[PDB]
Amino acid sequence: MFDVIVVGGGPTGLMLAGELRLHGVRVLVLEKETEPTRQSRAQGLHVRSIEVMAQRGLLERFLERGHTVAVGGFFAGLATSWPERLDTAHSYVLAVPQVITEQLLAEHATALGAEIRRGRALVGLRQDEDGVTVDLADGEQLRARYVVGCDGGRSTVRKLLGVAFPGEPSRVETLLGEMEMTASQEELTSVMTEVRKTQQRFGAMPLGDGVFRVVVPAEGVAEDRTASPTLDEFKQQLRAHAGTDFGVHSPRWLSRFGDATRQAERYRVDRVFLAGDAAHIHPPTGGQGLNLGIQDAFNLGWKLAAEVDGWAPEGLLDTYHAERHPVATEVLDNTRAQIQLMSTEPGPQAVRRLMAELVEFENVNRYLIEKITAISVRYDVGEGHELLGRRMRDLALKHGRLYERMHEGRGLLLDQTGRLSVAGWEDRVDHVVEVSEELDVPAVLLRPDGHVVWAGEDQQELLTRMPAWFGAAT
Ligand SMILES: Cc1cc2nc3c(=O)[nH]c(=O)nc-3n(C[C@H](O)[C@H](O)[C@H](O)COP(=O)(O)OP(=O)(O)OC[C@H]3O[C@@H](n4cnc5c(N)ncnc54)[C@H](O)[C@@H]3O)c2cc1C
Ligand SMILES: [Cl-]
Ligand SMILES: [Cl-]
Ligand SMILES: [Cl-]
Description:
Blueprint: E1 2-7, H1 11-21, E2 27-31, H2 47-54, H3 59-64, E3 67-69, E4 93-95, H4 98-111, E5 115-118, E6 122-127, E7 132-136, E8 141-149, H5 156-159, E9 167-168, E10 174-179, H6 185-195, E11 203-206, E12 212-217, H7 231-241, E13 253-257, E14 261-263, E15 272-274, E16 280-281, H8 289-309, H9 318-341, H10 346-358, H11 362-372, E17 412-415, E18 443-446, E19 452-456, H12 459-465, H13 467-470
Parallel strand pairs: 1-2, 1-8, 2-5, 8-15
Antiparallel strand pairs: 3-4, 6-7, 7-8, 9-14, 10-12, 10-13, 11-12, 14-16, 17-18, 18-19
The structure holds flavin-adenine dinucleotide and chloride ion (3 copies).
């Protein structure tokens, strides 16, 4: 049998498979699609996702296949500028296609020793008090201690548990397409900016290889929710919302996505977990579905690997739902506000003009970017320092950065004075003694995902918060 079986070869399951392999966990990735989909969904990581890869040393391969972008207009298309005093060392946006993002995460999980069986489709599942039984379409049963559901928005695992999926349905659908056009490239650059003053969800971005990525609003709601949109439909929407069809060339692939904002009610149902789109779906327009799914698995990874090793605290796995469900609600809630600001009605247009006056303030622009990039996410840990909950930025230490010592996914203890020590938790927590100037506190205790659970200078105060997140001593 296996220790953990994840259901989904997407960027969420691959990120969870790598986090579990850092602790020697026999994992198994079940993916329905044999060949990975060539549909370029997302187009890059945000600041927090960039920091997540840096904590594992995966940032080099991402930066080799992409390029950094520091512009304005990521919040509801409000074309501004990038903030100045952004509390993060990776204050930029890496532009990598999701196909490359899934490719690097799959190669890293395979390099760490993860069974990725492509072509296996989960049909049914059931669980006892000792493990979970998985029934595949081919008829092969698989026993596992814990199973996590990363099988996308139409999650089969979620339906096999009764976990409700409440939220608002799809009301405003949009058309996306990677293509070229008979119109000049320089001519479209001057046309999009003029129409964007009213219809904000009309865009066009180049890919360098001669093709572009044009997103055009659609009319009505499609009843199939999976039917291939015709090319004549694409030009009819381009001529109605932009005044010119551009005469498109060869289209690589077309799609039509909705704006249904739904979120799972339970993230854990006793040995079965949900992550990524399996636990929350929201519109791609103002979306963090790739950033959220990565950070969801980045939160569950070290926690689930702590249970199979036997040192996890009592209700550690219960905190996955208690910490990643509110993050999905506020994200999903922000996506609705961003589409609302993109509405063409005279009401929402007046609110967008008010927001445009407020984003001129740097603190307002910084607050929105810190919330969108998810670098301001703060969990509930307890009472104490002002750092309790938030992650720790890449602090420049005396010898190298800070994220260069967290590759093994172990507990970190930044000790600037050296008088603090770990007694009995050496098997889970390291002891980095490096003086930093960006840190105004004597010592910080970091969870494997970077979030702070203790900050101070007392040894006895350290002895209080150590077993709360790392179990008892040896
Ligand atoms: C057009 C578009 C643009 C987007 N743009 C962005 C963006 O700019 N930024 C951003 O952050 N997010 C963006 N997103 C959202 C983000 O891409 C998704 O949320 C993300 O792909 C979901 O990650 P996941 O691995 O959890 O889901 P998936 O990638 O859907 O993973 C599910 C995988 O498991 C497989 N599977 C399904 N059911 C089963 C089963 N029963 N058994 C086995 N395997 C199964 C599926 O075939 C699939 O391969 C966009 C989404 C879309 C559609
Ligand atoms: Cl605007
Ligand atoms: Cl760097
Ligand atoms: Cl102003």
